[PDB]
Amino acid sequence: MTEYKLVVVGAGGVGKSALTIQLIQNHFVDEYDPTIEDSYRKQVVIDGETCLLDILDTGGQEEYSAMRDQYMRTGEGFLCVFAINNTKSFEDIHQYREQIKRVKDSDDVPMVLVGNKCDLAARTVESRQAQDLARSYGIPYIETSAKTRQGVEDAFYTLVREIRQH
Ligand SMILES: Nc1nc2c(ncn2[C@@H]2O[C@H](COP(=O)(O)OP(=O)(O)O)[C@@H](O)[C@H]2O)c(=O)[nH]1
Ligand SMILES: [Mg+2]
């Protein structure tokens, strides 16, 4: 069976844990210990192929847990997440991508830019701004809501399809 190693990165509070929990357990949590950093597994069929997702939900920043470094170096694809109502988290994306390019020593790394919390009103980051950023990196942009489930499967499965074109 094919395994796909995915890593979820982004500023604190954007919904990295919520997105992962939604994919894994199909439920939305209003509060998830921001310190909890762990890996989750899920068996799913994507385009007729049964595979196992090995997902690392990264926690704190400016820190390198023995596990994060491992997934960061062995990770096959990255979900770079920001929130639609958090301009700083969007501006922060540049830092996460520069970091990933450094670890892989490459500018061709499977990656998907995710704009989360699309269920919230009065967004401060327009879809167009994110689309422009994703285009500049040569990767897809997908909006999601860990609360309503909108785009969640699409974000993770598209990341798998990016790894496949690699
Ligand atoms: N309305 C809304 N709240 C969300 C969404 N995703 C996450 N949250 C909330 O945002 C806060 C931070 O989410 P969390 O998953 O802990 O963020 P992380 O720090 O990136 O892991 C929590 O209070 C969540 O309930 C979403 O899509 N919509
Ligand atoms: Mg978290």
Curated annotation (Swiss-Prot):
Changing N26G: Loss of interaction with PLCE1. CDD domains: H_N_K_Ras_like. Palmitoylated by the ZDHHC9-GOLGA7 complex. A continuous cycle of de- and re-palmitoylation regulates rapid exchange between plasma membrane and Golgi. S-nitrosylated; critical for redox regulation. Important for stimulating guanine nucleotide exchange. No structural perturbation on nitrosylation. Gene3D superfamilies: P-loop containing nucleotide triphosphate hydrolases (3.40.50.300). InterPro entries: P-loop_NTPase, Small_GTP-bd, Small_GTPase, Small_GTPase_Ras-type. PROSITE patterns: RAS. Changing Q61K: In NMTC2; somatic mutation; increases transformation of cultured cell lines. Changing G13R: In SFM; somatic mutation; shows constitutive activation of the MAPK and PI3K-AKT signaling pathways. It is a lipid-anchor. GO terms for cellular component: ciliary basal body; cytoplasm; cytosol; endoplasmic reticulum membrane; glutamatergic synapse; Golgi apparatus; Golgi membrane; GTPase complex. Belongs to the small GTPase superfamily. Ras family. NCBIfam families: small_GTP. This is GTPase HRas. It comes from Homo sapiens. The lineage of its organism: Eukaryota, Metazoa, Chordata, Craniata, Vertebrata.
